[PDB]
Amino acid sequence: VDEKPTETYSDVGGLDKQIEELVEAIVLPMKRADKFKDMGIRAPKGALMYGPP
Amino acid sequence: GTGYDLSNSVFSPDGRNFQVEYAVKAVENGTTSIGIKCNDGVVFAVEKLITSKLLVPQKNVKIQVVDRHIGCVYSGLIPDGRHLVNRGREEAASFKKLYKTPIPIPAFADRLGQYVQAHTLYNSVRPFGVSTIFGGVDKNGAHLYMLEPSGSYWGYKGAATGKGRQSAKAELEKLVDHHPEGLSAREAVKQAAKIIYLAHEDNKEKDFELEISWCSLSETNGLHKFVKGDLLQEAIDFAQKEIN
Amino acid sequence: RNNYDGDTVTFSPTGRLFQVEYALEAIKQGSVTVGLRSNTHAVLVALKRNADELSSYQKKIIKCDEHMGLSLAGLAPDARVLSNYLRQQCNYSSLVFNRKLAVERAGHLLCDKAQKNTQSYGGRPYGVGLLIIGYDKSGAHLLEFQPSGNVTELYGTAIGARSQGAKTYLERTLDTFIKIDGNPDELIKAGVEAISQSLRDESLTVDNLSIAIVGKDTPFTIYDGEAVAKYI
Amino acid sequence: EVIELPLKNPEIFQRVGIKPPKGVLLYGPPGTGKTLLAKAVAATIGAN
Amino acid sequence: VDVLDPALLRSGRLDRKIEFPLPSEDSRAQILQIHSRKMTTDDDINWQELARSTDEFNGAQLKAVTVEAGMIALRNGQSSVKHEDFVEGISEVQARKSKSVSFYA
Amino acid sequence: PGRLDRKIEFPSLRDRRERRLIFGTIASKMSLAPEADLDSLIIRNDSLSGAVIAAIMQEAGLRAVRKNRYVILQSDLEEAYATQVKTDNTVDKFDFYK
Amino acid sequence: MSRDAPIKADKDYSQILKEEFPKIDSLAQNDCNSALDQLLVLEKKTRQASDLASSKEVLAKIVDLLASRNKWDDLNEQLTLLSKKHGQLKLSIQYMIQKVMEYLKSSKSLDLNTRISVIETIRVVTENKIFVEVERARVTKDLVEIKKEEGKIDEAADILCELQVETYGSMEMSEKIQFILEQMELSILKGDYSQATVLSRKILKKTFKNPKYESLKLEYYNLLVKISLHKREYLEVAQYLQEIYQTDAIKSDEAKWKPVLSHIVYFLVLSPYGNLQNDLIHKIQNDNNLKKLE
Amino acid sequence: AGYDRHITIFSPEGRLYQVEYAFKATNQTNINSLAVRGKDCTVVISQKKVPDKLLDPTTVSYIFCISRTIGMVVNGPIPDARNAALRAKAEAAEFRYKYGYDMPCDVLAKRMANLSQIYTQRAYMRPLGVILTFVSVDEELGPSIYKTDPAGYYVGYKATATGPKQQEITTNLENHFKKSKIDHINEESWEKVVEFAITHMIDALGTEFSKNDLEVGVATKDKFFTLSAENIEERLVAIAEQ
Amino acid sequence: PGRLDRKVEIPLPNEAGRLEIFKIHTAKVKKTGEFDFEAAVKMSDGFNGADIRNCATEAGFFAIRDDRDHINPDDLMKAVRKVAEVKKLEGTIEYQK
Ligand SMILES: Nc1ncnc2c1ncn2[C@@H]1O[C@H](COP(=O)(O)OP(=O)(O)OP(=O)(O)O)[C@@H](O)[C@H]1O
C-alpha cells in the first residue's frame, strides 16, 4: 500500500449495473459477513472484469 | 480441437465430424421452439424476440406450414430454416401428386432426414444448422419429431430446442409427470404459453412476442392453423397469472 | 482465430459464419438509406454519393415495378443482380396470375436467392442490403433485407453508414408518422428529417435527397433533382 | 483399489501374486474436484 | 477474455464473470458531465445532444471528446470553451478522419 | 563410431510370438484359474507393449480383489484388459487391407 | 423409462390392500391360494420401489402357511417362484430372505421343517452373490447346529468351511471371526487340523488388537493350542498360551490367569531345546504372579 | 499428417486413416447387436437405449424392414443409419422388377459393400460410419448373416456381434460353438432361438433387460417381422423360468 | 503405467449426478424447502462441480438484494441461469485425451 486515495463510484460515470454486480462480489461478503455466517455459503475467490478496453 | 473442421466430411480420430457439432451450437443461439404432442393433436409454440419496438407485431412468423396439415417451426438461423421448409413443400407436393393423398408424418421424417444428410455427405456444401420440430395428424394419429442439424430424428412426446432448451425440456418433463395420459390440445394451448414464458429468461435482454399454432384432429379438422383471437388471449392470461 | 473465415462453407466453433457478418460490414461502409411507412404510402429517402464534383452522383433507388421499389446500401454490382431478380418475379406475376406481387412473398423469394449462395461452395452471400417497400392489396409494407437473407417487416428502419442516428429519430417519432394517412407530404417530410440526423460532417444538398414513393393512388415515381426541391 | 487396499494391508495382494500397485492419475476437465478428492482422502485415512 | 485459459476462468478461482459493455447512450452522457466537473461549464452546452451524436464511442473516447474540446478552445485563443468546440471534439477521434473508402458507393 | 556402433531398436508394434511369451511368463509368477485365456488378448489388440502387460495383470488382481477372490477368472481378465486397451490405429481388427 | 403411470398406481395399490389386510387373512381360512394370488399380481410390476412395498404384505400372509405343518410346503414353492422371475431388481427379495429367518425361529417348527426350508433357501441363492451373502452365511448356521446333535456333524464341517470362501459380504468383523472359529472347531472334529490352519491364516492377527473382539482373541488362541498339540509341537502350544496371558481379561482377573500360567510352564519344558525356549523360560521367573503358585 | 484430411490420399503404410476412423464411429449410439443362426430362423437382438424420457420409445429403432424377406440392424449413428436403409430398400426394389425375383442376403450385402467402395473410391463423398448387418433366411442357403463394413469388406458368419462391448459378446459365442460342434442352434422353433440370444447377452454385459431396453427382429422362413415390446416381454420371463 | 497402474478419469457430472452434488450443499445452506430444483439442475447443462457450489453462492446474492433470509425458487433458479450463461461465453471446456 502507498495509501491509495478513494475517488468514489460516483466519479465513475454511467455503468450503474456493472458497479452493483462488482460490489456484490468484493465489498459485501466482507461487510455482510454476518450473512455468510447466517446463510452458510462459501466466499467467492475473485471477480473477473472483462470487456472491450 | 484443431483440424478436421475446415471440411464437412472429414472424420476426426474420435470418430466424428467437428463442423457438424458446431452446427448444433448455432441452433442453440436461435430462439426457443417447443412442440407438445397431444392425444388428438400437436401444439407448436415459439418465442419470437423483438428486434426493436419498431417491429410490426403478429406479421412475422417462424411458423411455416407444409402442404395443408404439417406444421414446422425451426430454431437456429431464421433464413436457413426457411430454405429447408421450401424444399419440404416441394417434396410434400410430389408425394401428394404421385399418390393422391396427403403425407404420413413418418414419410416426411424420412425425406427431410435425407436432404440434411445429403449436405453432410459432400465437400462443397456447409451442412444445415437448424433444428426443425414438425408433426401433424394422420390416419395413424398424432406424431411429433424434432430433426437436429445432424440429421437425426426420433419421435418425442414433447421436444424443445434453442436458447431455452434448458428450461423447456424441464417443463415438458413435469408435463409428462402431471399428464401421462395425453393432455387435450385445448389445455395444451394454455400450457404452451407458460413453457415459453419461463424459457424467455434465457433471452431476458430483449422482449418477446408469443405466437401459438396448432393442428388438431377434432378442433381443426386435421388441418394446421394459427391460434389467434380468444384462444390466444386466454393462454396469455394463463402464463401472466402463474409467472407472477 | 480466424481461420474459419476463408470459406463460406465452414461453420465457426461459435456457430457463426464470419463471411455473412463481413457482408453486414460492407453495408455500413456504403451509403445510408431510410425506410418508413404509414398505411397509405411507403416512402424511401436515400443519401446519394458522388466520387468527385465533376461526378453527378449515383442512383440508389431502382424502380422495381409500378407498385414496388427498393433502395440499396453496400456494393453496387451485388445490387444490380437482386433488383433484376426481383423484377423477373414481378413480371411473372403479371404474365401468369395477372396479379400484383405481394411484398411478403417477394421477400421470401429473395430469402431463397440468398441461401442458394450460402450453401454453395463458390460465390459469396450478396454484399448489399435492400430496404424494400411496396403497396399491394393489403396496403403498404416495408421489409429490411440482409445478407443472411432474413426479411423482417418493420414500420421504419435504416441500414448503412452511421444509421443509429436515423434509427434514434425513428424511434422517437414512430407513432407520429403512423397516424398520418392521406397526406403524402407529411410522410415525405418526416423521412427528410431522419436522414438529416444520420449525417456527420456533411450537409444536405438538392442532389443528396432522393425520394421514392408508392401509395393507394400513387404510381411508382422516382424524384431527384428539382423534384425534391419542394421538399428540401 | 490401487491406493487404500495395499496401504491398509499389502498381505492379501501377496496371496494374489501381483506387485502391489502405486500411482493414480486424476485427469479431467477442471473444476471437477480432483483437488477436493485429495483433501477428502487426506481427511479420512489420516496418514503422513 | 478469448485467450484466457479455461482452467483459469471457471468457479473456485474466479467465481464472478462481470462484463463491461461499450457505454450506452445515457451512460456516455453521464461520463461527459463527470469530467466537466473540474473545468469550465457553459449553459449553452447540452450533454444529451452530444450523447446521441456520439455513436460507437467507448468511455476513453469520451474523455477524448472532453479533452479535445479544450484543445479547440485554446487554439481559438478563447479563455472559454463553447459548445461548438465540443462538436469539433467529436471529429478528432472517430477511428476515421471523416471518410469511408469504397469503389462501389 | 568409437562410442556407439550398436543401435539396437526397441519396437512397439511387435508380433504375435512375443506378446504370447511375455503373457505366459507373467502368468507363471501369480495365480491363475482354468478359465483365463491369455492367447485371446494378443489378437484383439496388436500394438501392445511390455509395460502394458505389467498394467494388465496388476489390474486383473484388482478385479479379483473386488470380488474377493484368490484366483483370476475370465470375467476378471476381460475387464481389466478393457482398461488401458489403447486406442492405437496401428492395430489390426478394423482392417480391410487383407 | 417414459411412462410414470405405473410408478403411481402401484404405490397406491400397496397402501390400499394393506388396509384390506384383515379381509384377505379371513378369506385365507376360506381359500389360502385365493388370497395369495392378489399379492402376486403386484410383484409382476417393473418398478422396483413399489415391489419393495408389496413384498411387506407377502411376508404378513406367509406366516399362516409356516405356522401350519403342511402349508409350509407351499412356502418352499413360493420362494422359488418369486426369486427366479426377475428378483424385482435385486432389492425386493433380499428383505424377504431376512424376515423369513426371524419367522422360522418364532414358529418353533419341527427340526425337519426348519432344515428343508433353509436347504431350499440356499439352493436359490447358490450362484447369486450380489448382496445375498450378508444374509446367506446366517442362513446356513441354522443347519450346522441342528446337525451337531445328528451323527451328521462331519457333514456340517464340509458345508460351512466351503461356504465362507464364497461368502464374506459386508458383515461386521465380530461375526466373520465367529464363523471362522466355529469352522475350526468343526475341522478338529473332522480330523483335518491342517485344514484349520489355512482358515486361521485368513483372519489377521492384527485384527485382534481392539477390545470389541477381546473374547474372540481368547477362543482363537486356545483353538491354535489344540491344533499344534494334535501334531505334538509343544513349542507352538507354549507360545499360544503366552498370547492368552497378555490379554487383558486373563491377566487382571485373579482366577483366570491361574490355569494359563500352569499350562505355559508344563509345555515350555516339553518344547525342543531351542534358542526360543531359553529366552522365554527366564521371562517366566521375572513375573511375581508365579510366586503365588508353588 | 495429410492423410485423414483427404479421403483418397494414402499414408506411407498403405492405410487410409480416414476410412478407419469410420470403423471407430460405430460407437456414437453405444449399442450392441448380436445376430445368431438357428435351424429355421435368423435372429437379431440389439439394444434399444432410449436415453431420455422426452422421447417416445416406439419410434426408436435400428432394425429396419428392408423388404418382404430382408431386415437390417444398424450399429452406429442415426443419420447414416437412414441413408444405409433407404439405399438397401431402393436396390431391393430394383432387383425384384429387373430380375424378377426376391433379393437374397448375399446379393444385397455385396451390392452395398461395392457401393461403400465407390464412396471411398471418390473423394467427392465420404464413407459412412455405420456397420450394417443383414439378416435373412435365404431361399436356398437358409439362415444367412452377412456383415457389410464401412470400407466395403464383407464376410459371412455363423454368429457376429457389433458394438463397444462386442469383445465380451464374442468369447461367450465362441465357447458355445466350440463345445456344440455345429454351426447352428438346434432349437427348432424361433421362440427359443430368440431366448438363446437374450440369454448370452445378459451374461456378457452383466445387465438385465426390460421391455424398453431391447429390440428384436426375427427373420423366419419366407416372412419377416420385428417384435413388439410385449412379445419381447414373454421371451424375457421364459429365460428367467426354467 | 507401472508407476501409475490405474488411470482414473474424473469426467463432467452427468445429468443425474449434478443434482447429487447439488443436494449436499443445500443441506448446508438455508432454504424455503425446494425439490423442484432437482429437475431444473438436471436439464440445465454447462456445469461442473465447482460451478455447482457457485450456484448456491450466486443464489445468496439475490437473497441479499431482495432481503430474504432464505433461498426461494425465485432466488435459486435465477442463479442457475446466471452461472450457466457466463459459462457459455467463455470456458469452452478443455479437450481430454
Ligand atoms: N465432487 C464434488 N462434490 C462437491 N463439491 C465439489 C465437487 N467437485 C468439486 N467441488 C467444488 O469445487 C471446488 C473446486 O474444485 P477443485 O479446484 O478441487 O478442482 P480440480 O478438478 O483439481 O481443478 P483445477 O486444479 O484446475 O483448479 C471444491 O472446493 C468444491 O467446492
Ligand SMILES: [Mg+2]
Ligand atoms: Mg486442482
